[PDB]
Design an enzyme around this catalytic site. Structure first.
Site, mmCIF file in Angstrom:
data_model
loop_
_atom_site.group_PDB
_atom_site.id
_atom_site.type_symbol
_atom_site.label_atom_id
_atom_site.label_comp_id
_atom_site.label_asym_id
_atom_site.label_seq_id
_atom_site.Cartn_x
_atom_site.Cartn_y
_atom_site.Cartn_z
ATOM 1 C CG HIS A 27 2.225 4.885 0.675
ATOM 2 N ND1 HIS A 27 2.701 3.914 -0.175
ATOM 3 C CD2 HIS A 27 3.315 5.581 1.097
ATOM 4 C CE1 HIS A 27 4.015 4.021 -0.278
ATOM 5 N NE2 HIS A 27 4.405 5.029 0.484
ATOM 6 C CB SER A 40 7.577 4.192 0.614
ATOM 7 O OG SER A 40 7.085 5.189 -0.258
ATOM 8 C CG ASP A 71 -0.154 3.034 -1.793
ATOM 9 O OD1 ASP A 71 0.154 4.092 -2.392
ATOM 10 O OD2 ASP A 71 0.712 2.302 -1.258
#
Lengths: 319, 319
Positions: B287, B160, B257
Site C-alpha cells: 500500500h 488511499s 495490501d
C-alpha cells in the site's frame, strides 16, 4: 460466456464468439486453425499508420531466417531496437496477424521492432524456433547498422508463446554470454508445460484461450516430456541461480487467463533471483488482449499498449 | 516481514522498518502519528524538479479552503487540471508529505495538480473533508482561469483515502450535475468500511498498512455506523444505477495490501455499471507504493507513476 468482472467490451466479444459457434480450434488442421486467426484479424478496421515495414532475410547460425523490420516513420538515424516474437500457440500466428500489436509497440516506443519469422509447429518442433529466435537476436546485435538500428540497445518482446520465446531468448543470451539485452517485455507469457495452476482450473473454458487449446499447442510444439522439463521450454522450472543476471522485465498478465498464474509465478522467480521486475495484472482482460483486433480499442487494452511502448522506450534510451 | 513475492527493494524496506521497531501507529496521538510520515518522507533525497508550486486560498461553499497549485514548469498557457486528494488515513498526510507523488503526476502528465488542504480527522469527521473536496473541485471548474487552468478539462486523483475522496467527489459531481469530469485516478483506494475481504485477512500485519491502522483511520473519520453505510463513505456500497455515468477510471491496486480486494471490487462495480475502467494490480507492491519516498526509485513504482501520469494526460487532451 466469460465471468463476473470481465471488462464490458471483452465480455460482449466473448458472447459474440459463443453465438457464432464453430469447432474447437484444436479440432482443426494447422492450416484451418491459422485461417481462423488470419480471418478474424482482417475483419476489423485498425490503425497501422506511423510505421515503415521492410523485409530482410539473414544468414544466421546455419540457416536463412526471414525478418520484418518495423521502423517508426519519418525518423532519421540509428534507433534502438526490440526483437518481436509472435504468439499463436506455436501452431498459429505470423507477421500480418500480429502487425497491429507490433505497430502499437513501435509507435508507442519510438523503437524499431524486428519480427522473426520462426518455423511454426508441427512443421518444426522444439527447439527449432527458439534457436532461430536467438540466432536472429545475436544477428541484430552484431549487424544492427545494416537495418538502421543500434544493436547495442536491444530488447526482446513477445505475446503468449512469443513471451515464452522472449524469456527463453534472454536465458539463451545469458548462457551464451551474448548479446547484452536492456529489457524483456513479456505479454501474458506461457512459462510452464503444466496445467494445474488455479488459473488453469478456473478459466478452462469460456474465456477464449482454453485448456484444450493450450494442451494442443504444447503437443504440436513437442511431445517429448524431457524437452518440456528443460528451462528453454518451461522457464518457470529455472532455479534462482539460473535466472540471476537476466535483464529487467515487464510482465503483463491477464486476470481471466489460464496462463495468468504461471506468468505471475515467473515474475516472482525473477524477483527472487534479484532480477528487476515490474509485474502488472490487467484486470478484466482475457488472454491475447493486445493481439486480438476486435479488442484493440478497448480502453484498458489501449492503456496496456501505452505502458508496453513506454517501458520499451524507457529501457532503450541512450546511456 | 512481508511475504513471498514482495518486490525485492520493498521487502528490504519492510525488514528495515521491522528492525527499527517502534509503537504501532494507531497507539500514537494524531500529532505524533503525523510526525512519523513527515519524518520518514523527509529522510530521503527525492527529485522535486520540473514544477512550480503556488498557494491559493479560495472561498467555496461557505468556507475558506487552502489549495496548492502545482504546475509544470516553463510552460505557457492554460493547462488541463486534476484535483489531488491526499492519503494518510484521514488522520495523517498533507501537501509536503505528498509533494513527491504530486510532482511525479504533474511532470508525467503535463497537467496542473490542485492539492486541496481538507480538514484532517479527528479534528473534523465525515463528511467535512469530502464536502471541502467537492467544493474545491466545482471552484476549479468555474474559476480555473484564475489559476492558469482550463477548468473544463478536469480530473480527480488521489491515493488511499485520497482515492476514496476522488471516487466520492466523482459521485458528488454526478449527484450535483456539475462539474464535468474527464477522468478519475484511484491509487489503491479505500472503498468500504468493512474488514472481511480476503486481502484484509491475508495482509493484516507485516505489510506496512495494517488492519489495526485501517480500523483506527476509520474510527477517527467517523464512528457513525449509518454514515459508514452511505455511498459517500463506502462507495463500494453503490448500486449499478448509482454508479452509471461516472467518468473513466484508472484504478491501480497493490498485490500486498489489505485494501486490494475492495479496490478491485469497486473497479468491477464501475465496469458492471457501464463505466469505462482500467484496473491494474501492481504485483509485489505494498500500500502507498507511490507515496512512500523510500520506495520512489523502485522500478515498478516508477513504472506505476509513468502510467498514472500518462493516463491523466490521455484523458485531459483537447477535444
Amino acid at each position: 460466456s466469460g465471468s463476473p468482472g470481465v471488462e464490458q467490451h471483452t465480455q460482449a466479444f466473448l458472447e459474440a464468439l459463443e453465438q457464432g459457434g464453430g469447432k474447437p480450434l484444436e479440432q482443426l488442421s494447422p492450416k484451418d486453425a491459422r485461417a481462423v486467426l488470419t480471418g478474424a484479424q482482417a475483419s476489423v478496421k485498425v490503425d497501422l499508420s506511423g510505421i515503415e515495414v521492410k523485409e530482410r532475410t539473414i544468414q544466421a547460425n546455419g540457416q536463412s531466417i526471414k525478418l520484418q523490420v518495423v521502423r517508426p516513420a519519418n525518423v532519421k538515424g540509428e534507433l534502438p531496437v526490440f526483437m518481436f516474437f509472435h504468439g499463436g500457440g506455436w501452431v498459429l500466428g505470423d507477421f500480418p496477424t500480429h502487425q497491429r500489436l507490433i505497430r502499437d509497440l513501435v509507435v508507442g516506443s519510438g523503437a524499431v521492432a524486428v519480427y522473426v519469422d520462426y518455423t511454426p509447429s508441427p512443421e518444426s518442433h522444439y527447439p527449432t524456433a527458439i534457436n532461430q529466435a536467438y540466432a536472429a537476436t545475436q544477428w541484430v546485435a552484431e549487424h544492427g547498422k545494416e537495418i538502421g538500428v543500434d544493436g547495442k540497445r536491444l530488447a526482446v518482446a513477445g505475446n503468449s508463446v512469443g513471451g515464452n520465446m522472449a524469456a527463453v531468448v534472454a536465458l539463451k543470451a545469458k548462457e551464451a554470454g551474448t548479446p547484452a539485452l536492456r529489457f524483456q517485455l513479456l505479454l501474458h507469457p506461457v512459462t510452464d508445460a503444466s496445467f494445474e495452476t488455479a488459473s488453469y482450473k478456473q478459466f478452462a473454458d469460456g474465456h477464449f484461450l482454453t485448456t484444450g487449446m493450450m494442451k494442443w499447442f504444447w503437443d504440436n510444439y513437442t511431445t517429448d516430456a524431457k524437452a518440456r522439463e528443460q528451462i528453454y521450454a518451461s522457464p518457470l522450472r529455472a532455479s534462482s541461480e539460473q535466472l540471476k543476471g537476466l535483464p529487467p522485465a515487464l510482465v503483463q498478465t491477464a486476470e481471466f487467463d489460464v496462463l495468468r498464474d504461471e506468468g505471475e509465478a515467473y515474475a516472482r522467480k525473477l524477483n527472487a533471483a534479484g532480477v528487476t521486475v515490474t509485474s502488472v495484472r490487467y484486470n478484466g482482460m482475457i488472454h491475447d488482449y493486445g493481439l486480438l483486433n476486435p479488442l484493440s480499442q478497448v480502453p484498458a487494452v489501449k492503456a496496456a499498449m501505452r505502458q508496453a511502448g513506454t517501458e520499451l522506450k524507457v529501457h532503450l534510451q541512450l546511456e
